Amino acid sequence: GMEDLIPLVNRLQDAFSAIGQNADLDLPQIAVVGGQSAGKSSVLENFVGRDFLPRGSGIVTRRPLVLQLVNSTTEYAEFLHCKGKKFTDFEEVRLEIEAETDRVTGTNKGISPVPINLRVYSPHVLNLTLVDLPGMTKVPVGDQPPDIEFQIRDMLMQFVTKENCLILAVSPANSDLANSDALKIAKEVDPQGQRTIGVITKLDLMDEGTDARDVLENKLLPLRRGYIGVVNRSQKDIDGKKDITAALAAERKFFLSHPSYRHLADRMGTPYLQKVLNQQLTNHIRDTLPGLRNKLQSQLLSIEKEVDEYKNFRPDDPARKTKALLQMVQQFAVDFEKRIEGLSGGARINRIFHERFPFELVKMEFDEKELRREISYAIKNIHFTPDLAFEATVKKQVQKLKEPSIKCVDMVVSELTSTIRKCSEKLQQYPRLREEMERIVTTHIREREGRTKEQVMLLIDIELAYMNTNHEDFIGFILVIRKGWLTINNIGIMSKEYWFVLTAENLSWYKDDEEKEKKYMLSVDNLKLRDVKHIFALFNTEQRNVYKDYRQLELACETQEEVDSWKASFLRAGVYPEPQLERQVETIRNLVDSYMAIVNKTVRDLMPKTIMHLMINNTKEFIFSELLANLYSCGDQNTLMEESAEQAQRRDEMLRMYHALKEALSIIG
């Protein structure tokens, strides 16, 4: 059915162009690709016989133009967006392309990949169908090209990387053909030149003494499908547009009369071209169609998967709909149960409860020195004293567990918020639902935070209101000894003998055995004795000083005996050779410590259970048993499960693609 292969395929160009697609479908079609210095406009316009492309600076074609040249005996054209209204004046066609391009382009001159299908019936053409793309500019001596150059390139690339795309490469004769944008492109994407047809324009513009024959005789960059030459002499006017008859006559003439192309005149020109493009297109289609119908199936059995995942994602078709909300909610709930009870939320909570909180408490503890200071101070406060020093200091220490206990509530409100936020990622599928849900649960948590903190405070107060001393882990509740001469080998040293008198209370010493001058008097309280003539020394245990600033008194005497008897005398005075508070404060310290151990153990046990009960569990039950209800009563079960514009659009695209693929596959059957 050769004759119908071009009309067939360009019935697929409609079906897909109707949804804004064409390139990405790998249609057997021809892509016009050239620099602006070629005038692909003139070639197309020469096919049709009537000027009809947009005129202005920069690119003539700003959106792909699926030009469907169809032969007939009547001359007229119709669009795809304006199907029904048949065009008869071509300047209208031009202005209509301009219009329909300015519509989508949103700029006086900015491009777009979204094709326009323009079907033209005339007796001036064969059944031929081309996709006109934007032109390019040859980059001048070095120099970086303009963004738009790169955009254009990327587009022509979008089209001609498809293996089914025949690249009609249009270069100018009057420019170094080595450096020729169209051919460079064609080469990069089809390095063995098997789907490129070169067209060489302006052959009558080369310098005197230079022809492009080594290129057309297919010998420079030879292509499989060859080169064709064309010149553009729109010779007459049927009033303003092309007298294609005289112009094609002129072309013929140029090729017959030019000695370098003479011998090729038959294989050159617009007509011949039309004939060639026609042949090669029809064969290309015949050869590629079987693959295409298969591409189109792998694509339609991919769109059925996602269409099936979506059409089932939302059941707004049966009286279901709400069933969807219900399952979303059940998902959230399960996420949450699993998370907070098993690196993650429940584990972090375990570490808060049983590793940190204990430490937060410990750092609120009275260290030995400040605890003894506190107790002593509490005794100075109460001119029974034991009992109330105990109460005082316990209540002191206990007041300080409120911070670490409030604190803990926070570290948990924190991980709980963190978890609601993770769980609620699995609702991005639904923006309003995710929003309102995360909101509500975050709220419930902040109320529970209030009530939970209150209770924790209260527990410490309760602990303060009564010292339970019955708790079973509360494990508590002047005649003279001797006189003698004696020498000081330490005094002065900057060391005379003195006359010593040891009573039972004081060792005092004089200048002479007469006893008129008392040089010093020392209390034997707290004195002890060490060894160091034969020499011993007295020192004071409570502190550091005994005799003025002398840490120890150095006493020396000639005989070992003298010493021994003196020592024996100091012993009788209570000075051996090596206060109520001190003891009381210790006692109370032990009591306090014990009762505190009991309190700590308790608080460490009870704050976690309080937080579980009033916050965690509370929140859980809320999610499992109240939440959905609240979302119902106070919910637009329609409005909540609304489509993020994202998926709404993506899935309009999905659907459109679905229908377009259906149409295509049935068209090919």
Side-chain angles (χ1 to χ4, degrees):
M2 297 306 99
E3 313 136 354
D4 285 349
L5 286 163
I6 290 176
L8 162 60
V9 160
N10 70 17
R11 193 180 143 187
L12 292 180
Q13 305 195 318
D14 286 346
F16 283 126
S17 180
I19 70 181
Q21 304 274 324
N22 174 279
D24 296 278
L25 277 52
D26 217 335
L27 288 178
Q29 59 191 359
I30 303 161
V32 180
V33 152
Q36 274 172 224
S37 49
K40 34 175 208 64
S41 315
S42 97
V43 183
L44 291 164
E45 286 181 350
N46 277 354
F47 292 171
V48 179
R50 311 290 188 218
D51 281 307
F52 66 90
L53 301 168
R55 290 211 162 262
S57 47
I59 56 191
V60 165
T61 287
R62 271 180 310 154
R63 283 169 64 182
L65 182 63
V66 175
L67 194 81
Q68 280 157 5
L69 262 56
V70 184
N71 167 261
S72 62
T73 61
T74 180
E75 178 158 59
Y76 79 93
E78 69 174 289
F79 278 92
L80 194 68
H81 53 280
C82 275
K83 272 225 167 183
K85 279 192 184 165
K86 306 178 189 177
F87 291 83
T88 48
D89 170 319
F90 284 97
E91 195 176 25
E92 298 166 347
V93 180
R94 168 192 284 118
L95 302 176
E96 178 64 19
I97 298 172
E98 288 189 57
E100 168 64 13
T101 294
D102 273 353
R103 182 168 72 79
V104 169
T105 56
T107 41
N108 280 347
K109 50 172 48 190
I111 79 177
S112 162
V114 186
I116 298 176
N117 295 10
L118 176 59
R119 191 173 304 194
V120 198
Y121 309 78
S122 69
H124 293 284
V125 310
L126 297 175
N127 285 280
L128 185 74
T129 289
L130 299 179
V131 174
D132 197 14
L133 302 176
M136 314 181 270
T137 281
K138 293 184 177 183
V139 306
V141 50
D143 210 63
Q144 75 286 322
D147 263 286
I148 179 52
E149 205 50 72
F150 295 137
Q151 291 202 355
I152 277 166
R153 203 203 50 191
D154 281 32
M155 183 161 304
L156 303 179
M157 277 288 154
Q158 165 166 313
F159 277 70
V160 312
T161 64
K162 273 52 181 184
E163 311 144 15
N164 294 11
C165 187
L166 283 166
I167 309 159
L168 186 65
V170 189
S171 303
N174 65 349
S175 271
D176 189 11
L177 283 154
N179 173 5
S180 155
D181 296 314
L183 292 158
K184 303 197 298 189
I185 278 301
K187 214 176 283 174
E188 192 177 348
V189 300
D190 173 14
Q192 283 286 4
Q194 294 181 14
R195 48 189 185 92
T196 310
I197 306 165
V199 158
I200 305 189
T201 76
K202 302 179 182 246
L203 283 162
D204 62 321
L205 285 187
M206 313 202 60
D207 299 19
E208 293 280 276
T210 172
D211 72 50
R213 83 166 156 74
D214 50 21
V215 186
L216 307 173
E217 293 168 335
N218 221 72
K219 301 179 174 174
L220 206 55
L221 179 63
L223 293 147
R224 184 183 140 179
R225 306 171 188 259
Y227 298 93
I228 295 152
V230 182
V231 307
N232 176 26
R233 288 182 177 151
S234 306
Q235 265 308 308
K236 294 168 188 168
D237 276 326
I238 305 182
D239 282 23
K241 287 175 195 145
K242 301 193 177 188
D243 179 321
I244 181 181
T245 326
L248 297 185
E251 190 165 64
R252 186 72 194 170
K253 252 185 309 178
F254 173 80
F255 288 109
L256 295 181
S257 54
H258 196 274
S260 306
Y261 317 140
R262 187 177 188 68
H263 58 268
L264 298 165
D266 268 348
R267 297 303 164 268
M268 307 282 173
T270 276
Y272 175 63
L273 185 52
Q274 291 196 34
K275 285 60 184 168
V276 156
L277 299 197
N278 195 280
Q279 199 204 4
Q280 286 190 41
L281 181 53
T282 315
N283 297 116
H284 190 53
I285 299 173
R286 175 193 189 273
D287 307 316
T288 63
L289 209 74
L292 173 55
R293 166 192 60 104
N294 299 351
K295 155 151 182 147
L296 294 199
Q297 284 186 21
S298 293
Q299 304 204 114
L300 185 55
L301 258 56
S302 188
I303 280 302
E304 280 189 28
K305 290 184 181 180
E306 286 204 87
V307 160
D308 186 83
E309 100 168 89
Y310 172 83
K311 280 181 187 170
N312 278 345
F313 247 163
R314 265 155 278 236
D316 184 71
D317 308 308
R320 292 201 67 107
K321 331 174 188 297
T322 69
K323 311 192 185 174
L325 167 48
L326 183 161
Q327 300 152 341
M328 296 297 318
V329 166
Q330 292 188 314
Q331 182 66 80
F332 190 80
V334 167
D335 259 45
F336 184 92
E337 189 175 57
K338 194 144 195 192
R339 287 199 200 271
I340 52 153
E341 301 178 2
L343 269 162
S344 48
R348 295 194 75 181
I349 291 304
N350 181 62
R351 202 183 288 267
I352 279 171
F353 282 2
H354 303 277
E355 189 190 280
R356 180 67 177 256
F357 182 51
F359 171 81
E360 285 303 37
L361 292 171
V362 171
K363 85 162 186 67
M364 286 296 86
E365 184 171 353
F366 271 121
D367 92 328
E368 302 165 355
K369 274 288 183 167
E370 69 193 43
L371 198 282
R372 59 154 290 275
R373 286 181 210 174
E374 223 51 67
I375 288 163
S376 87
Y377 207 75
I379 305 160
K380 187 184 163 76
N381 279 358
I382 298 304
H383 44 288
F384 272 83
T385 301
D387 175 322
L388 309 168
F390 169 71
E391 279 212 295
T393 312
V394 171
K395 287 167 66 156
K396 267 286 180 55
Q397 177 72 57
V398 166
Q399 185 63 248
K400 312 190 78 80
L401 313 192
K402 274 175 190 182
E403 229 178 13
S405 295
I406 263 47
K407 189 170 296 183
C408 169
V409 166
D410 275 319
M411 296 178 162
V412 165
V413 162
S414 180
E415 296 301 317
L416 222 58
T417 285
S418 190
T419 293
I420 297 308
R421 297 177 181 278
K422 287 200 56 60
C423 291
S424 73
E425 286 183 12
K426 287 177 188 176
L427 310 175
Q428 60 188 243
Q429 316 297 335
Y430 276 130
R432 255 172 202 88
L433 189 44
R434 182 176 184 179
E435 192 186 32
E436 305 293 0
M437 259 179 149
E438 192 171 336
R439 199 188 56 75
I440 277 174
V441 188
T442 277
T443 300
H444 186 76
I445 287 173
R446 295 312 269 225
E447 270 149 11
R448 300 321 297 173
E449 187 197 272
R451 207 192 151 189
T452 293
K453 281 175 181 182
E454 286 173 8
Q455 184 70 199
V456 168
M457 298 291 293
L458 180 50
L459 293 152
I460 278 50
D461 290 333
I462 295 201
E463 264 301 347
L464 284 174
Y466 181 71
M467 313 307 110
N468 183 4
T469 271
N470 303 263
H471 195 87
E472 56 260 78
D473 305 352
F474 189 51
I475 316 163
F477 279 19
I478 304 178
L479 296 175
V480 42
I481 296 182
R482 181 194 294 273
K483 315 180 73 174
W485 280 95
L486 223 69
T487 293
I488 301 191
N489 265 126
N490 201 34
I491 194 174
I493 54 173
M494 296 164 182
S495 300
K496 290 213 163 194
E497 57 184 335
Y498 297 106
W499 171 258
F500 279 70
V501 171
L502 174 63
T503 86
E505 296 282 46
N506 318 83
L507 168 94
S508 49
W509 67 81
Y510 304 94
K511 179 180 51 46
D512 56 35
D513 74 302
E514 231 159 62
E515 268 185 44
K516 41 193 194 74
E517 295 183 18
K518 177 178 279 167
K519 287 170 176 162
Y520 200 81
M521 159 159 295
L522 190 45
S523 175
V524 299
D525 291 345
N526 291 319
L527 274 175
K528 288 179 69 182
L529 202 161
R530 67 158 64 83
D531 278 315
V532 289
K533 287 179 160 293
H534 278 43
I535 315 188
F536 72 103
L538 292 186
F539 71 88
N540 166 277
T541 71
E542 277 192 330
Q543 38 176 68
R544 303 181 174 173
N545 293 252
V546 301
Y547 157 51
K548 293 162 197 167
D549 38 348
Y550 284 100
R551 289 181 194 173
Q552 74 188 36
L553 192 55
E554 170 178 352
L555 312 183
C557 31
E558 203 83 29
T559 50
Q560 152 74 5
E561 166 71 26
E562 195 162 330
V563 177
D564 268 36
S565 84
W566 264 102
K567 283 190 186 173
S569 283
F570 277 117
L571 184 45
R572 187 167 126 175
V575 182
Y576 295 62
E578 62 166 2
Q580 300 173 350
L581 299 175
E582 300 160 14
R583 326 152 179 211
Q584 187 186 350
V585 158
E586 185 53 33
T587 291
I588 270 70
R589 174 227 201 276
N590 294 333
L591 292 168
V592 160
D593 264 339
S594 194
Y595 186 87
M596 282 308 311
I598 294 172
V599 165
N600 282 278
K601 216 169 165 179
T602 300
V603 170
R604 284 202 308 278
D605 188 80
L606 281 181
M607 292 326 159
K609 307 183 177 172
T610 298
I611 295 158
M612 278 292 91
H613 179 245
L614 286 173
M615 172 142 274
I616 303 325
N617 299 32
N618 194 290
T619 295
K620 204 169 180 297
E621 180 189 359
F622 180 68
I623 295 174
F624 274 70
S625 66
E626 309 213 37
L627 180 52
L628 182 50
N630 298 338
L631 271 175
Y632 278 149
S633 57
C634 318
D636 271 344
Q637 309 169 24
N638 248 332
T639 307
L640 290 187
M641 308 198 57
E642 190 160 41
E643 319 206 39
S644 43
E646 65 190 37
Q647 276 149 347
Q649 183 225 325
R650 264 182 235 109
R651 277 129 181 187
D652 266 339
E653 293 290 303
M654 204 187 290
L655 294 161
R656 281 170 188 166
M657 178 53 49
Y658 191 53
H659 189 50
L661 283 172
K662 277 178 172 177
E663 282 181 66
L665 279 178
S666 66
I667 287 180
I668 292 155

